[PDB]
């Protein structure tokens, strides 16, 4: 009799690399490099028409962001301004701090402003056809008695968390607008803690017309640690805070600017979430979560069967 | 492979064997047949699954890192951030390349090894009752019906039963 020993083979073999050979066919292999994303980021908070900065200021249309908490803030390219024209001298730094902090927890505070009128509004910032303003900000103007006395107010921090105060300075278009709004000319703001300060002198002049306004507001911020305190000092043009945002001690979040629409996935890339079954990935060097490691190869086949020897 | 069975003294694989990775083909008085060997098949599969278990579904969590794309020229610090990331990627790309080349060489060698072990085990079973024809086939020097072939495949073959018949056939003129 005859007894033959043997092994299987397949018609559809796969080429793999080994130590001694660039191209050897095995019966089966599996891919070790993840090369695709489904194009969506599967805790996300969609800013929709509000970028993270008007979100923080509380512009019209941003109320849906109140109380929001996120791992990744999704900021949209088609976001638009809906309020009084503004700029932020260190724009990208403020945007970083808000995004990294990862929540909009606002704590209202009562500021005992003196003599001056509060809650100034504007046609550039309409809410349901009524003149309005940033709902986190408080536009101070002169009294009906044409008075704007020096403001001198203090907020002490003996909570157990650092406070973020966002405040601004208004730049009128003309001397008339300056006096009509704040009496005094020039205005001036100084905001300070024990160890830091910011001082701003308004700059009067014509800027391009935006929503019917030639003036601008420049926004600033102050962080107040526990055991520190903040002092607001003004003879005009202050856009006052209505309180502060809470800062997490540990800041672990970030922001992603994309038009891609919003599932469950542990690994996030700017291209979208990717499966993490594979040890490596070729999608993006930027990742968040339990992710395969980024490599330069587009493919890496691991043999999962014997050498394929047909005939 | 380093043992010289697969793509070696075994000329080619069997596409018609779809119930196992290794097996037996026989020809006797009752006909020609094929049967898979489950133990050697499973031994190879277990080792490959062991490799997969080390590689599949074991990624590591990273959260806040450094920036890796830049919109403005900055010089020194940005040069350093870019260089750090480029260094890291090249070292991981190396690790990945070597891992696959090494595991694959080993997978091809372990599967060749399992084939060789099955052949060696079968050879010892047959004792003086058969001769190796050099192509993975044994010439069995006695009448071996289906149950006899089956006894070889399942490790119950008693060589003493056939030894006299086999020796007379092997050693003659």
């Amino acid at each position, epitope marked *: 009799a005859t007894l033959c020993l043997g092994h299987h083979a397949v018609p559809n073999g796969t080429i793999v690399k080994t130590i001694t050979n660039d191209r050897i066919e095995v019966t*089966n292999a*599996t891919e070790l490099v993840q090369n695709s994303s489904i194009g969506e980021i599967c805790r996300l908070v969609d800013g929709q028409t509000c970028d993270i900065i008007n979100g923080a200021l509380g512009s019209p249309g941003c109320d849906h962001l109140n109380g929001a908490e996120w791992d990744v803030f999704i900021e949209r390219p088609n976001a638009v301004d809906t309020c009084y024209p503004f700029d932020v001298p260190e724009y990208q730094s403020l945007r970083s701090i808000l995004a990294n902090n990862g929540k909009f927890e606002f704590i209202a505070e009562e500021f005992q402003w003196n003599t001056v009128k509060q809650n100034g509004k504007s046609g550039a910032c309409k809410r349901a056809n009524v003149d309005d303003f940033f709902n986190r900000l408080n536009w101070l103007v002169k009294s009906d008695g044409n008075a704007y006395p020096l403001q001198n107010l203090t907020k002490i921090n003996n909570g157990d968390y650092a406070r973020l105060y966002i405040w601004g300075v208004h730049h009128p278009s003309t001397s008339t607008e300056q006096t009509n709004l704040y009496k005094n000319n020039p205005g001036g703001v100084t905001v300070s803690t024990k160890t830091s300060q910011t001082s701003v002198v308004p700059d009067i002049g014509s800027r391009p017309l935006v929503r019917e306004q030639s003036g601008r507001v420049s926004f600033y911020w102050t962080i107040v640690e526990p055991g520190d305190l903040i002092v607001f000092n003004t003879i005009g043009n202050l856009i006052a805070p209505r309180g502060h945002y809470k800062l997490n001690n540990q800041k672990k979040s970030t922001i992603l600017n994309t038009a891609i629409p919003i599932c469950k996935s*542990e690994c996030i890339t700017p291209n979208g979430s990717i499966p993490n*079954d594979k040890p490596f990935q070729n999608v993006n060097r930027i990742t968040y979560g339990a992710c395969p490691r980024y490599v330069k190869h587009s493919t890496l086949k691991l043999a*999962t*069967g014997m050498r394929n020897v047909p005939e | 492979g380093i043992f010289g069975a697969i793509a070696g003294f075994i000329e080619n694989g069997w596409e018609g064997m779809v*119930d*196992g*990775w290794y097996g037996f083909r026989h020809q006797n008085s009752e006909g020609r047949g094929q049967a898979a060997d*489950l133990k050697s*098949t*499973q031994a190879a*599969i*277990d080792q*490959i*699954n062991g490799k*997969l*278990n080390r590689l*599949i*579904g*074991k990624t590591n*969590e990273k959260f806040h890192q450094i920036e890796k794309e830049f919109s403005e020229v900055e010089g020194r610090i940005q040069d350093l951030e870019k260089y750090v990331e480029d260094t890291k990627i090249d070292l991981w790309s190396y690790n990945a390349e070597l891992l696959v080349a090494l595991e694959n060489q080993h997978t091809i060698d372990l599967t060749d090894s399992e084939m060789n072990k099955l052949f060696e085990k079968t050879k010892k079973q047959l004792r003086e009752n058969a001769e190796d024809m050099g192509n993975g086939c044994f010439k069995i020097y006695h009448k071996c019906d289906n149950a006899c072939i089956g006894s070889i495949r399942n490790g119950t073959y008693d060589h003493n039963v056939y030894r006299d018949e086999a020796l007379n056939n092997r050693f003659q003129i």
Partner: antibody
Amino acid sequence: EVQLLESGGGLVQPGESLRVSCAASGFTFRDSALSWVRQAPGKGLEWVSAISGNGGATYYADTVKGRFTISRDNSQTTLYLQMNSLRADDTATYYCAKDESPPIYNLMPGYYSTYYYMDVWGKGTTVTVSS
Amino acid sequence: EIVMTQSPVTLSVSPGETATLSCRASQSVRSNLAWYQQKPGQAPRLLIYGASTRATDIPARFSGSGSGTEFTLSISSLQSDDFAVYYCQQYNHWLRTFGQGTKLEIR
């Protein structure tokens, strides 16, 4: 529907044998693995053994390493478990449980993937070992 | 040969609150880890497998996480019918082991 039904069990004197059947009915083509898990009222779960393909398991817990033996009859689609040399602590509600593995494992459909999780549990058969 | 210890033995959680469970495991284990919901007088039911991947057609309030040694199981929105006992298994040592069990209470 992937339900299985456990038959047999009952009261036995310590030292005797008893085999429990598990009629694997439904979606299970019975090229997938099956397992036995026992639980005594007043105690938690404990994995007993497993079966794969044909004779690939051979997988028994250390408590029953030399006593229990697992049979599989794919022709009649029934899983067995011969419990010999039963002791007092063997009194438990023996559950027959399905076994599933991640699709990356289980290369050959018949053989054992050494990483299984039980998804579909059975009704269970109570076995009491006393005097 | 690889012991599993759940903590605590029993926990009391008001309905609606999130109940976090523990499944500490000696020696490393990541690939395979399955959670179960064994209601009294019934067979165990698979909830999560691997570590975080939940079973088919089970509520999204059952969350799973963990790595290597420490593993957790959190039930988001709790219901009065969740008074079951929960267990966790592991790979592999060619010998799977179960957990001790965590009793969940609901006034």
